[PDB]
Amino acid sequence: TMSMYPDFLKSFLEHPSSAVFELIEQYEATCNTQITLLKKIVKRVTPGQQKFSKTASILWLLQQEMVTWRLIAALYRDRIQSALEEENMFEIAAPNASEKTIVDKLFQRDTLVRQSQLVVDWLESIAKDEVGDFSDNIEYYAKSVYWENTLHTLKSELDPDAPIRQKLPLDDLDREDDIRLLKYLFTLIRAGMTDEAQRLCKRCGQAWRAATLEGWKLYHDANINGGTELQAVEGNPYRCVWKTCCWRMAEDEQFNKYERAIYATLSGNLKQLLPVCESWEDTVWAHFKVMVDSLVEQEIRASIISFNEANELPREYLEANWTLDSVFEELQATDKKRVLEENREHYHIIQKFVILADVDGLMDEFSEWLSNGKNLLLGHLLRFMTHLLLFFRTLGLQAKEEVSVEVLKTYIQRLINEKQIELIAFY
Amino acid sequence: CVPAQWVHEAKAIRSRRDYLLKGHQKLVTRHLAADASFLGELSNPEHCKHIQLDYIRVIDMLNLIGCELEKLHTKVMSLCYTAKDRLAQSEMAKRVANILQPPESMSDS
Amino acid sequence: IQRYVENAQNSASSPKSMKGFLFARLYYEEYELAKRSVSSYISVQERDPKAHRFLGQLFEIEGNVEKAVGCYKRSLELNPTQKLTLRIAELICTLNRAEYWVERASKGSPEIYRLKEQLLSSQWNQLFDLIQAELFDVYVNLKLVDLFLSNQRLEEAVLHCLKPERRAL
Amino acid sequence: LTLLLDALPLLEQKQVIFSAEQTYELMRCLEDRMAAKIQKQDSSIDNTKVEMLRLALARNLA
Amino acid sequence: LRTRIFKHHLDMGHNNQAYDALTQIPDPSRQLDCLRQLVVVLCERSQLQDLVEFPYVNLHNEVVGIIESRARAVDLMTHNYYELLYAFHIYRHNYRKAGSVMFEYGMRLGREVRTLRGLQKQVNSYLACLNCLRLIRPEYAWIVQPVSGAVYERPGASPKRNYDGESSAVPSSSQIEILELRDLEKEYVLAQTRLTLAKHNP
Amino acid sequence: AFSHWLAHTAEERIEEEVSLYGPERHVEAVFSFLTGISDACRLAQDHRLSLLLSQMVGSQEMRELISLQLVDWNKLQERLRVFCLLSGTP
């Protein structure tokens, strides 16, 4: 595993002969392979299992290195590549164009909001799903029909509205079974696994819950909205009513905690008990989702797309949007007024800096820590900044030459210590 | 006892049994609401600054006293109880002072 | 698009900044009339960065820098989305608070460092330093040595003209 | 009670004074009955009562 | 000429019925004091039905400042009980909040001079305050001093926070809403018990 | 033009009638407010049903899906009638 310095610098050897972007993609892949070796093969029994978990956490640093390279690649590919330069055709619209064409336009025109979406797509890519068929969440929740226990045992109407309508009905077993469903649908919604959430809602027998998921999509008619001509019309033309109805349904108690939370994620609002177990990536996702859902609605309002009748609960919804900067600052604080331990992590601070777009600010600032005798403790962090700077200058002439020399010099000194003579000498 | 920053921890526990400054050495907002004295409030504001609720801090600064934005923030604070009513009255008084004025009139409206 | 302006006219009659703004959008798709519509919409309420900039651009080119400050000041302090910046600082410079605004603007924006120096030049050693700071590009180095010439620094200027001059030729 | 209010309106309720105090007691009794066991309508009666008080004030001014 | 018009109009009192001319003085400039002294002489003429109908024509911003200035003058401690009721009618037109506070101020003065036959009047005053509270159900209103001549500010109703315990020595009698109204109800029950004990003596 | 026209026609009849209906009891009314949407939803405030109700006035191919699926679910086990309306073939 000492031959890890080879794999990154081997990705360097191919790059004088070839092209820039595959270097970052290979850095994602190289770190990904290294996660697996450290992670595998480790067996934990009793007390050691904890030791194995600690080992995984250390590798966990390599996992974080893979996720960070993926994010770096995704954002720089949007920012530098010709994907931000195109005809304004997506934004050429008329009042008769549907609310969906208006969202397609907003995402094309607003690069800043679209960058938030690329971060969301990344956070969804690295989400933890519970298992279907190898955990009690869905394997043991394979009940043939919905509310079989409450139907078979008394203790009037099958519909989900019957227990919101009146007190006590549901059997404890059916509530326990619903907890597993909604938790698993909720993990899938966080993972962006919307199609799987719909497939499960249909197969579990929950056609009503499936219908709520369908109301994500805005109305598109292919006939009127010729830009994205599909074949059938799709989505719901009163999305604001649907958003408010979903928000109201989220607030209502006597529903499961996981259900209220899916409705909160759909409404672009926060949830409460489920966020107690929300990690940094998970909290970043929920808060960016609020920012996207508020921004889209404000553009829809400014365009005059929304109808006054659909405004059932304006007073209950946050009209304001926070900036990406405030998103990270609020997420960075702990609930107990401490620096968040996850935010303070050396590679997580970089993820945020790549999202803000001030990458080069930390690259100069980090180099100052080397002269001040800091960073040396984390063996990965010194390497990371080296490869990251090398990648920045190849894609765009960016980081200061002074910083490149200081970072490369300290990195080459390490190659002699690790005795990587052919590569260290070259650096 | 061997030096550690355990003095604040012990002092805080004693206060709970029977204060805010000792804790410093949501709740702060509640304290401000109770204190809808002035020097103590200033000290609390300084502590908040050291900690840095930002909107609440801005409101406190306004009370101690771009302008339109500040007025909007004050309105938001008013939007979000007898103590609350008193705070609203104080905000109205502040608006009157500001008027003493089209923006002020709008705030009054 | 004519049906769309009928439904806009009717809505306005019924009650409506977003109608009046929409009319402006239709106009963008008879500029004086559109500008008038934008002005009315702005008066009714404050909405979208595209509203604020269409009115503020109309007033800016009408020469009415007091109306353009009014829009852009409300669009900043309302908190909808201010990043007008040119007309505000420029307006302050024309007027001859302003220093604070300049500092805020400064907080690698070149023309902004330039307008800042010129404000300081209406409100000598500090001025000389300003040029030295900017210079730390041949034409930078050349205006730097020319205004050193003005302040009276013959020894420094000939070294820092010649240094440039055989960095460029 | 509604009939009494109508009579006061016909009269203008100059001297009722006690009745407004009396009316409050009746309202309290109604609340007690509710506790033992139309809100808009109840508000209207209060408004009608206020008119009598205003008339009494006018009489005092006279 | 205009300073003569004030002096001359005041002395006659009869031509000082010129309300639209009264309203035409505050709108140009801060000569509100001319309206304040002149409308007092019109109150001395004392045709309150007609007199109060003309401040419907006068602008409400001016009417609030003139009627509040008049209401502070109504705290004259006069036997003119009606001036409080006509102030209550102007408060009825506005937010109504101050009519309740003016009633407690008038109750306090009526308690201070003498007792006994004032008990039945205090019952009527409790009925008036209870009716005024029912009219103004969601909104709060604060008292300052026991009437006009105020040298206290507004301590509020949300500053229940102390400092050290020496800053909780403020009288805290700004918050004379629903809680003190329940204490006035206790005063009424004490009066009822005293009267029932008094009826069992002969 | 016809929609609103139809409403006005079925007015007074749905007017004072549905009035009492509400100020009375019980179900069905939920269906009757749908014949009259946002005020009916606000009065009703069944969170999942509320989101499906906003698809009414939508001619979208939502019909069939929700239609058959909900019916099947009920078979396996004032709500079926709402689904019949969103099927578009009531």
Could you tell me the CA-to-CA distances from A333 to A299, A328, A342, E196, F82 in Å, in that order? 30, 9, 10, 66, 47
Q: Across the interface, do C7 and A320 touch by the CB < 8 Å criterion?
A: no
A387, A8 Cβ separation under 8 angstroms: yes
Chosen from C3, C18, C37 to mutate, greatest number of chain A CBs within 10 A: C18
**Of F47, F60, F79, which has the smallest distance from its Cβ to A248's Cβ?**
F47
Residues of E in contact with D59 (CB under 8 A): 82
Q: Does E152 touch chain B (CB under 8 A)?
A: no
Q: How far apart are CA A203 and CA A206, in angstroms?
A: 7
**Of F41, F61, F65, which has the smallest distance from its Cβ to A245's Cβ?**
F41
Direct distance between the N- and C-terminal alpha carbons of chain C, in angstroms, rounded to an integer: 60
Q: Does A241 touch chain F (CB under 8 A)?
A: yes
Q: Across the interface, do F48 and A202 touch by the CB < 8 Å criterion?
A: no
Question: What chain E residue is nearest to B44 in terms of C-alpha separation?
Answer: E163
- What's at A34, amino acid-wise? Q
E175, E157 Cβ separation under 8 angstroms: yes
Output the six-digit token pair for A39. Answer: 């992670």
Residues of B in contact with C74 (CB under 8 A): 68
For residue C101, count other CB atoms closer than 10 A to its CB.
Answer: 17
Could you tell me the CA-to-CA distances from E78 to A99, E81, E110 in Å, in that order? 69, 7, 11
Q: How far apart are CA A27 and CA A25, in angstroms?
A: 5
**Of B35, B40, B93, which has the smallest distance from its Cβ to E159's Cβ?**
B35
Q: How far apart are CA C91 and CA C67, in angstroms?
A: 11
Q: Across the interface, do D57 and E124 touch by the CB < 8 Å criterion?
A: no
Q: Give the up-direction half-sphere exposure of residue F82: CA atoms within 13 A in the CB hemisphere.
A: 26
A238, A110 Cβ separation under 8 angstroms: no
Method: cryo-EM
Q: Which residue, among A244, A241, A121, has the nearest Cα to A193 in the 3D structure?
A: A121
What is the 3 state secondary structure string of chain E? CHHHHHHHHHHHCCCCCCHHHHHCCCCCCCCHHHHHHHHHHHHHHCCHHHHHHHHHHCCHHHHHHHHHHHHHHHCCCCCCCHHHHHHHHHHHHCCCHHHHHHHHHHHHHHHHHCCCCHHHHHHHHHHHHHHHHHHCCCCCCCCCCCCCCCCCCCCCCCCCCCCCCCCCCCCCCCCCCHHHHHHHHHHHHHHHHHHHHHHHCC
Chosen from C11, C16, C22, C78 to mutate, greatest number of chain A CBs within 10 A: C22
- The secondary structure of A188-247 as a DSSP string is HHHTT-HHHHHHHHHHTT-HHHHHHHHTTSBPB-TTT-GGG--SS-BSBS-HHHHHHHHH
3-state secondary structure of A333: strand
Chosen from A291, A303, A324 to mutate, greatest number of chain C CBs within 10 A: A303
Q: Does A263 touch chain F (CB under 8 A)?
A: yes
Q: How far apart are CA E28 and CA A217, in angstroms?
A: 60
Q: Which residues contact E123 (CB under 8 A, 6 or more apart)?
A: D21, E188, E191
Q: Which residues contact F8 (CB under 8 A, 6 or more apart)?
A: none
- Provide the β-strand partners of residue A339: A333
C148, C128 Cβ separation under 8 angstroms: yes
Neighbours of D, requiring at least 3 CB pairs below 8 Å, are E
Q: Does C97 touch chain B (CB under 8 A)?
A: no
Q: How far apart are CA A77 and CA A23, in angstroms?
A: 12
Q: Across the interface, do C50 and A302 touch by the CB < 8 Å criterion?
A: yes
Q: Give the up-direction half-sphere exposure of residue A335: CA atoms within 13 A in the CB hemisphere.
A: 8
Residues 59-88 (C) with a CB less than 8 A from some CB of B:
73-74, 76-79
Chosen from C43, C52, C72, C77 to mutate, greatest number of chain B CBs within 10 A: C77
> Helices (H) and strands (E) in chain C — how many of each?
11, 0
Q: How far apart are CA E185 and CA E191, in angstroms?
A: 10
Compute the residue count for chain F.
90
Q: What is the CA radius of gyration of chain E?
A: 21
Q: Does C42 touch chain A (CB under 8 A)?
A: no
What is the 3 state secondary structure string of C79-122? CCCCCCHHHHHHHHHHHCCHHHHHHHHHCCCHHHHHHHHHHHHH
Q: How far apart are CA E151 and CA A116, in angstroms?
A: 57
Torsion angles phi and psi, residue A220, rounded to 5: -120, 125
Long-range contacts of E124-127 (CB under 8 A, 24+ apart): E124/D17, E124/D18, E124/D21, E126/D21, E126/E184, E126/E185, E126/E188, E127/D17, E127/D18, E127/D20, E127/D21, E127/D22, E127/D23, E127/D24
Q: Across the interface, do C78 and B66 touch by the CB < 8 Å criterion?
A: no
Output the six-digit token pair for A381. Answer: 């962090």
Neighbours of B, requiring at least 3 CB pairs below 8 Å, are C, E
Q: Does E135 touch chain D (CB under 8 A)?
A: yes
A353, A359 Cβ separation under 8 angstroms: yes
Q: How far apart are CA B28 and CA A255, in angstroms?
A: 34
Q: How far apart are CA E48 and CA D54, in angstroms?
A: 12
Chosen from A164, A221, A238, A257 to mutate, greatest number of chain F CBs within 10 A: A238
Question: What chain C residue is nearest to B70 in terms of C-alpha separation?
Answer: C77
Output the six-digit token pair for B82. Answer: 């007898």
**Cβ burial, residue C67 (10 Å; 0-12/13-18/19+):** middle
Torsion angles phi and psi, residue D43, rounded to 5: -60, -40
- What's at E27, amino acid-wise? D
- Nearest-10 crossing angle of helices C85-95, C110-122: 20
- The secondary structure of B12-69 as a DSSP string is HHHHHH--HHHHH--HHHHHHHHT--HHHHHHHHHHHHHH--HHHHHHHHHHH--HHH
**Of D21, D23, D59, which has the smallest distance from its Cβ to E126's Cβ?**
D21
Distance from CA of A109 to the nearest CA of F (A): 28
Q: Does E123 touch chain D (CB under 8 A)?
A: yes
Q: Across the interface, do A211 and F65 touch by the CB < 8 Å criterion?
A: yes
Q: Across the interface, do C79 and B72 touch by the CB < 8 Å criterion?
A: yes
Q: Across the interface, do E49 and D61 touch by the CB < 8 Å criterion?
A: yes
Distance from CA of B19 to the nearest CA of E (A): 9
3-state secondary structure of A339: strand
**Of C22, C50, C79, which has the smallest distance from its Cβ to A304's Cβ?**
C22
Q: How far apart are CA A385 and CA A347, in angstroms?
A: 10
Q: Across the interface, do C79 and B66 touch by the CB < 8 Å criterion?
A: no
Q: Which residue, among A55, A53, A130, A115, has the nearest Cα to A83 in the 3D structure?
A: A115
**Of A161, A215, A234, which has the smallest distance from its Cβ to F46's Cβ?**
A161
- What's at E154, amino acid-wise? R
Torsion angles phi and psi, residue E88, rounded to 5: -55, -40
Q: Does E32 touch chain B (CB under 8 A)?
A: no
A312, F41 Cβ separation under 8 angstroms: yes
For residue C68, count other CB atoms closer than 10 A to its CB.
Answer: 22
Q: Does A216 touch chain F (CB under 8 A)?
A: no
Q: How far apart are CA E34 and CA E6, in angstroms?
A: 7
DSSP state of A108: H
- What's at A28, amino acid-wise? E
Could you tell me the CA-to-CA distances from D3 to D7, D8, D9, D45 in Å, in that order? 6, 9, 10, 11
- What's at B73, amino acid-wise? H
Q: Across the interface, do B85 and E140 touch by the CB < 8 Å criterion?
A: yes
Q: Does E121 touch chain D (CB under 8 A)?
A: no
Those residues of chain D whose CB sits closer than 8 Å to some CB in chain E are 17-18, 20-24, 27, 46, 49-50, 53-54, 56-62
Residues of B in contact with C78 (CB under 8 A): 68-69, 72
- What's at A257, amino acid-wise? K
Residues 15-34 (E) with a CB less than 8 A from some CB of D:
none
